[PDB]
Design an enzyme around this catalytic site. Structure first.
Site, PDB file in Angstrom:
ATOM      1  N   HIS A  12      42.292  40.099  45.900  1.00 34.52           N
ATOM      2  CA  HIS A  12      43.006  40.308  44.891  1.00 34.52           C
ATOM      3  C   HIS A  12      42.630  41.801  44.274  1.00 34.52           C
ATOM      4  O   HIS A  12      43.220  42.028  43.203  1.00 34.52           O
ATOM      5  CB  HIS A  12      43.013  39.264  43.837  1.00 34.52           C
ATOM      6  CG  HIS A  12      43.645  37.919  44.627  1.00 34.52           C
ATOM      7  ND1 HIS A  12      45.145  37.814  44.707  1.00 34.52           N
ATOM      8  CD2 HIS A  12      43.331  37.020  44.857  1.00 34.52           C
ATOM      9  CE1 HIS A  12      45.545  36.660  45.253  1.00 34.52           C
ATOM     10  NE2 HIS A  12      44.259  36.070  45.322  1.00 34.52           N
ATOM     11  N   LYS A  41      50.607  35.819  55.091  1.00 32.16           N
ATOM     12  CA  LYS A  41      50.596  35.315  53.886  1.00 32.16           C
ATOM     13  C   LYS A  41      51.714  35.511  53.085  1.00 32.16           C
ATOM     14  O   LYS A  41      52.097  36.771  52.946  1.00 32.16           O
ATOM     15  CB  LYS A  41      49.198  35.854  53.087  1.00 32.16           C
ATOM     16  CG  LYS A  41      48.907  34.805  51.825  1.00 32.16           C
ATOM     17  CD  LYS A  41      47.811  35.410  50.914  1.00 32.16           C
ATOM     18  CE  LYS A  41      47.781  34.800  49.556  1.00 32.16           C
ATOM     19  NZ  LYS A  41      46.547  35.155  48.915  1.00 32.16           N
ATOM     20  N   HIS A 119      40.566  32.426  41.903  1.00 23.35           N
ATOM     21  CA  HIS A 119      41.887  32.426  42.345  1.00 23.35           C
ATOM     22  C   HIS A 119      43.083  33.138  41.378  1.00 23.35           C
ATOM     23  O   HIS A 119      42.473  33.147  40.182  1.00 23.35           O
ATOM     24  CB  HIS A 119      42.469  30.610  42.344  1.00 23.35           C
ATOM     25  CG  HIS A 119      43.727  30.563  42.291  1.00 23.35           C
ATOM     26  ND1 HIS A 119      44.710  30.164  43.513  1.00 23.35           N
ATOM     27  CD2 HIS A 119      44.548  30.025  41.135  1.00 23.35           C
ATOM     28  CE1 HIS A 119      45.771  29.755  42.724  1.00 23.35           C
ATOM     29  NE2 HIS A 119      45.757  29.675  41.604  1.00 23.35           N
ATOM     30  N   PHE A 120      43.890  33.784  41.884  1.00 29.79           N
ATOM     31  CA  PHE A 120      44.898  34.368  41.148  1.00 29.79           C
ATOM     32  C   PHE A 120      45.924  33.352  40.931  1.00 29.79           C
ATOM     33  O   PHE A 120      46.820  33.138  41.890  1.00 29.79           O
ATOM     34  CB  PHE A 120      45.354  35.830  41.973  1.00 29.79           C
ATOM     35  CG  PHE A 120      46.253  36.401  41.036  1.00 29.79           C
ATOM     36  CD1 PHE A 120      47.741  36.250  40.847  1.00 29.79           C
ATOM     37  CD2 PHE A 120      45.782  37.613  40.211  1.00 29.79           C
ATOM     38  CE1 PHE A 120      48.464  37.025  40.046  1.00 29.79           C
ATOM     39  CE2 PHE A 120      46.351  38.177  39.351  1.00 29.79           C
ATOM     40  CZ  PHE A 120      47.820  38.059  39.326  1.00 29.79           C
ATOM     41  N   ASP A 121      46.310  33.040  39.915  1.00 28.51           N
ATOM     42  CA  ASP A 121      47.289  32.125  39.755  1.00 28.51           C
ATOM     43  C   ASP A 121      48.940  32.479  39.349  1.00 28.51           C
ATOM     44  O   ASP A 121      49.744  31.946  39.562  1.00 28.51           O
ATOM     45  CB  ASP A 121      47.006  31.078  38.326  1.00 28.51           C
ATOM     46  CG  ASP A 121      47.678  29.708  38.499  1.00 28.51           C
ATOM     47  OD1 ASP A 121      47.336  29.130  39.413  1.00 28.51           O
ATOM     48  OD2 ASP A 121      48.181  29.126  37.478  1.00 28.51           O
TER      49      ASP A 121
HETATM   50 RH   LIG Z   1      43.658  29.751  45.369  1.00 29.03          RH
HETATM   51 RH   LIG Z   2      42.865  29.221  47.551  1.00 28.67          RH
END
Ligand SMILES: [Rh+]
Ligand SMILES: [Rh+]
Length: 124
Positions: A12, A41, A119-121
């Site tokens: 990210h 991905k 984590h990128f939400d």
């Molecule tokens: Rh994640």
């Molecule tokens: Rh993940």
């Protein structure tokens, strides 16, 4: 292993450019960050801000995560990002992506001691 924090940085963080100007940014970046290794991905976001600025989001606006957990945080300021979205014609292992540049608030999940993005939400 790779720490959850290190994996967030690999998946990210792209502090090196101000904005994906290049139609081809996602094809290159998804490959080199090893997001095409096991499959394509399907969606991924890169953030063009300093690591310190993105780590600081763990101290900013607390919001619900998409999965219902409480440990998500929205940036107070808009940030330079690039969304990568797999094309309809993309076939593993030739992963193909549409590159979209935007200035949006990011939402990250944070964990650990120290408390850092894992984590990128979402972006909003
Ligand atoms: Rh994640
Ligand atoms: Rh993940």
């Amino acid at each position: 292993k790779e720490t959850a924090a290190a994996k967030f940085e690999r998946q990210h963080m792209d502090s090196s450019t101000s904005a994906a100007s290049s139609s081809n940014y996602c094809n290159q970046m998804m490959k080199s960050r090893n997001l095409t290794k096991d499959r394509c991905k399907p969606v991924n976001t890169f953030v063009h801000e300093s690591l310190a600025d993105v780590q600081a989001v763990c101290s900013q606006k607390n919001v619900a995560c998409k999965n219902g957990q409480t440990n998500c945080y929205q940036s107070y300021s808009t940030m330079s990002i690039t969304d990568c979205r797999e094309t309809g014609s993309s076939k593993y292992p030739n992963c193909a992506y549409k590159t979209t540049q935007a200035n949006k608030h990011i939402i990250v999940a944070c964990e650990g001691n120290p408390y850092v993005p894992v984590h990128f939400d979402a972006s909003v």
